[PDB]
Design a binder for this molecule. Structure first.
Ligand SMILES: [Mg+2]
Ligand SMILES: [Mg+2]
Ligand SMILES: [Mg+2]
Ligand SMILES: [Mg+2]
Ligand SMILES: [Mg+2]
Ligand SMILES: [Mg+2]
Ligand SMILES: [Mg+2]
Lengths: 303, 132, 220, 135
RNA sequence: AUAUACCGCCAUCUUCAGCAAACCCUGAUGAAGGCUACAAAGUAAGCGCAAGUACCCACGUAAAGACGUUAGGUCAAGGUGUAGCCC
């Protein structure tokens, strides 16, 4: 109730002052971030679920929005649509319909809030079909040449919704290069690509044709440079650890592509991304499960 | 159907504390551990001894504060100090609470050769997290 | 308290037309609004025959004399309830007039339910709304039929809960359980507008007269 | 504890009976108004029936003497080109003008139906009405 | 000895999404049934699903998976009701 929440707010203010005193910080400039940090320090909980951890928040954030009593002492409800049982939702629908009637008489930046958001706004429980009806009505309003007078209302229900080029560094000898990293399965590769070079690729201090005697791996190394038409234009020094030959080749390919992004134009970078040369392959070995032969293989069924 | 440490649903008249309300798979996710010691860390020893001591302590406290424990004990081990944080009920007389606190501290200290403290937190009635 | 109630609540009950609702309409106004047009003779309801003047080329004609008498009674009842400060709830499932009826309710200070009548709004009211909720003291049906040409379940529920019901009953309606039936045309916008205006005017007159009488009594 | 037997008596009768019995301690707000100004019929639930034998609905078709003249006019000349304006309460169609002229001619003391019809047609032509026969 | 008395831990449908107390209504107040979104009697706390969480993402896999079915398995994990032996 309101009196309960008021008492809780008083308790929170007193406790916030106490916590500020405990941590030695200024009570006046003690913010919610400071309170959260202090509580996390004083009551360390490793529980994975953040909600299960200790919390000392404002009562407004803690307690759910309680709908106030909807009638007075005389018993008469306040809203003329009270007996619908969904007074807020139907009031909103009625207002939208009135706006649509007035409009009919006279004449990639945002989305529609979810049913949960609409329920939170209306402090009422809605249904999927009710939400769809309301969204259809709002869409009709949007299409019906809604001006500022209508757009100000409509926007209350709107919710707003490229590779990161590395900086080019310089070695001691003044040569420009770019450093990047990429992981494939268990293989991690750190690749340094120089702006100018004769196409040499030294992996772990070894020439690439020696490190990767497999034509498939050499082709994977080739794929990024060949794509952007820069074969023989760049020198590469790569260090790859972990995984097998193919995982290492893929990781080095990703690292080289990311490093070369610093030296290719933005259109070329986008083309590489579209070709999939900058995506980190998330496919990793799937854990074996108990009671079955492998990740998906099941034991031979015995009818 | 999994049965381990789950209080099965009922008509809504069964009160359950936070510990009971949560199934095993919520340990380290929504509920902590009722006994904290270094026995189970990597490279540490005496896990079996700590477990046996914990079991005996739980039984002994349950039988020594009958009908008083409002929730599971918490056994903390710091160095050789053993701290038993027990939530109890405000039914037994404070004289008997003090007598039993002193008794348990002394007896457990002599039995396990370690300083034992027993911290009682009293509540009017068992705290109900939800009604199952 | 005793004298206050005696002179406020029971004083208007001593007059045939305390709020003067008869002036709000005439048979000519109802005719001009087309209150006298019913459905085809095939859609006719057996209990609406007493109010049907005849059948003009298979189209029923509602006796506007009976409509005038019934409308007098219904408006007087509504005025007295509004004077007594009862809750008046306007029910209508005609989507063509949902907006109008809601606006009339808001303007006259009373309540409206023009939406899908969920089961139990009246019979299960204590559980749905709250144990202390106050149910409507009068229900005014601008369309006693739902959207499948069956009687509004609110009619049956209001009869169950002992809430008097004023109701516009067309020639295909069932006036058996409506306390104050007003035989008339509930499908013409003109007729519906006339009904809304009449009830709004009667309720506003009743409320303002209640305030005036209270002021007269309390100033002396 | 108002009785929820909407099929047994009317709300007024049930409320009155419960108040008499003492189940209802206080009369509901509307009881005094109802008792003062009751409806023309006590609202008692009645189950509807379908007429089966020789019973027929007492609704009588609304006919007037001028309906014969109207039918003859529409059969002889058709609807016409002057569209009805049903919004105007005093609107008069070509058929209605013909009916009025026929009625006054009958008042003049002519009985022959065909003679009245032809005379009315000629009179309307003189007045300036383009009575176009359908055949 | 009794899993055909059980607690305890589980298999199974479940590679499901339903189980639902408390009310209301319909059926002439029978067992029973309760939906149509341009809506026509259902409202529903709670449990589950979902969500949240672990692992490498918001994917995937784990985990979870209610009420019930098979007197399903286990008296041989232990405890335990009943019954039985005590040179
Ligand atoms: Mg399982
Ligand atoms: Mg109608
Ligand atoms: Mg079994
Ligand atoms: Mg699983
Ligand atoms: Mg889940
Ligand atoms: Mg068996
Ligand atoms: Mg067996």
């Amino acid at each position: 109730t309101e009196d309960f929440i008021k008492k809780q707010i008083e308790e929170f203010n007193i406790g916030k002052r106490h916590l500020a005193n405990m941590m030695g910080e200024d009570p006046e400039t003690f913010t919610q971030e400071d309170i959260d940090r202090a509580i996390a320090y004083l009551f360390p909980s490793g529980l994975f679920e953040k909600r299960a951890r200790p919390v000392m928040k404002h009562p407004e954030q803690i307690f759910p929005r309680q709908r106030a009593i909807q009638w007075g002492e005389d018993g008469r409800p306040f809203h003329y649509l009270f007996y619908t049982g969904k007074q807020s939702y139907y009031s909103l629908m009625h207002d939208v319909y009135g706006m649509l009637l007035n409009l009919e008489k006279h004449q990639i930046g945002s989305r529609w809030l979810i049913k949960e958001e609409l329920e939170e706004m209306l402090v009422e429980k809605l249904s999927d079909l009710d939400y769809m009806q309301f969204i259809r009505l709002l869409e009709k309003l949007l299409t019906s040449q809604c001006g500022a007078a209508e757009e100000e209302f409509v926007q209350r229900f709107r919710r707003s919704v490229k590779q990161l080029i590395e900086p080019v560094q310089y070695d001691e000898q003044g040569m420009a290069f770019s450093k990047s990293e990429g992981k494939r399965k268990t293989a991690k590769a750190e690749a340094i690509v120089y702006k100018h070079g004769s196409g040499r690729i030294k992996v772990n201090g070894i020439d690439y044709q020696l490190y990767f005697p497999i034509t498939q791996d050499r082709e994977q190394l080739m794929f990024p440079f060949h794509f952007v038409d820069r074969l023989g234009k760049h020198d590469v020094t790569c260090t790859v650890s972990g995984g097998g030959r193919s995982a290492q080749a893929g990781a080095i390919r990703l690292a080289m592509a990311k490093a070369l992004c610093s030296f290719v134009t933005e259109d070329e970078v986008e083309w590489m991304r579209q070709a999939g040369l900058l995506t980190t392959d998330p496919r990793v070995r799937e854990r074996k499960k108990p009671g079955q032969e492998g990740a998906r293989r099941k034991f031979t069924w015995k009818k | 159907k999994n049965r381990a440490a789950r209080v099965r649903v009922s008509k809504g008249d069964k009160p359950v504390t936070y510990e009971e309300a949560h199934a095993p798979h919520y340990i380290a996710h929504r509920k902590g551990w009722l006994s904290l010691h270094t026995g189970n860390l990597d490279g540490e020893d005496h896990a079996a001894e700590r477990t046996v001591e914990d079991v005996f302590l739980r039984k002994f406290m349950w039988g020594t504060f009958p009908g008083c424990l409002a929730d599971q004990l918490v056994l903390k081990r710091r160095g050789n100090q053993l701290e038993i944080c027990a939530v109890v009920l405000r039914q037994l007389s404070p004289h008997k609470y003090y007598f039993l606190v002193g008794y348990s501290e002394t007896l457990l200290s002599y039995f396990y050769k370690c300083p034992v403290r027993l911290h009682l937190q009293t509540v009017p009635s068992k705290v109900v997290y939800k009604y199952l | 308290s005793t004298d206050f109630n005696d002179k406020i609540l029971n004083e208007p009950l001593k007059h045939s037309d305390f709020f003067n609702v008869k002036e709000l309409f005439s048979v000519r106004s109802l005719f001009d609004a087309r209150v006298h047009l019913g459905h085809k003779a095939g859609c006719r309801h057996r209990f609406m025959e007493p109010y049907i003047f005849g059948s003009r080329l298979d189209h029923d004609i509602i006796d506007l004399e009976q409509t005038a008498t019934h409308l007098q009674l219904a408006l007087n009842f509504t005025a007295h309830m509004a004077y007594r400060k009862g809750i008046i709830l306007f029910i209508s499932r005609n989507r063509q007039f949902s907006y109008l009826i809601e606006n009339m309710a808001r303007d006259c200070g009373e309540y409206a339910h023009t939406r899908y009548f969920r089961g139990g709004m009246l019979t299960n009211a204590r559980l749905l709304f709250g144990p202390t909720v106050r149910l409507p003291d009068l229900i005014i049906f601008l369309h006693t039929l739902n959207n499948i040409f069956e009687p509004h379940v609110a009619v049956r529920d209001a009869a169950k809960m002992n809430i008097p019901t004023v109701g516009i009953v067309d020639t295909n309606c069932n006036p058996c359980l409506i306390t104050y039936p007003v035989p008339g045309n509930d499908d013409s916008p003109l007729a519906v507008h006339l009904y809304c205006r009449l009830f709004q005017t009667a309720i506003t007159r009743a409320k303002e007269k209640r305030q005036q009488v209270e002021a007269l009594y309390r100033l002396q | 504890a108002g009785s929820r037997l909407e099929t047994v008596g009317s709300i007024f009768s049930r409320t009155r009976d419960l108040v008499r019995a003492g189940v209802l301690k206080e009369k509901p707000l509307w009881f005094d108004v109802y008792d003062a100004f009751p409806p023309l019929r006590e609202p008692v639930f009645q189950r509807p029936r379908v007429r089966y034998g020789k019973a027929k609905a007492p609704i009588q078709d609304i006919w007037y003497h001028e309906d014969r003249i109207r039918a003859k006019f529409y059969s002889v000349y058709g609807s016409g080109q002057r569209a009805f304006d049903l919004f105007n309460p005093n609107f008069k169609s070509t058929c209605q003008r013909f009916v009025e002229k026929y009625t006054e001619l009958q008042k003049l003391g002519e009985t022959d139906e065909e003679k009245l019809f032809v005379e009315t047609g000629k009179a309307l032509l003189a007045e300036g009405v383009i009575l176009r026969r359908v055949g």
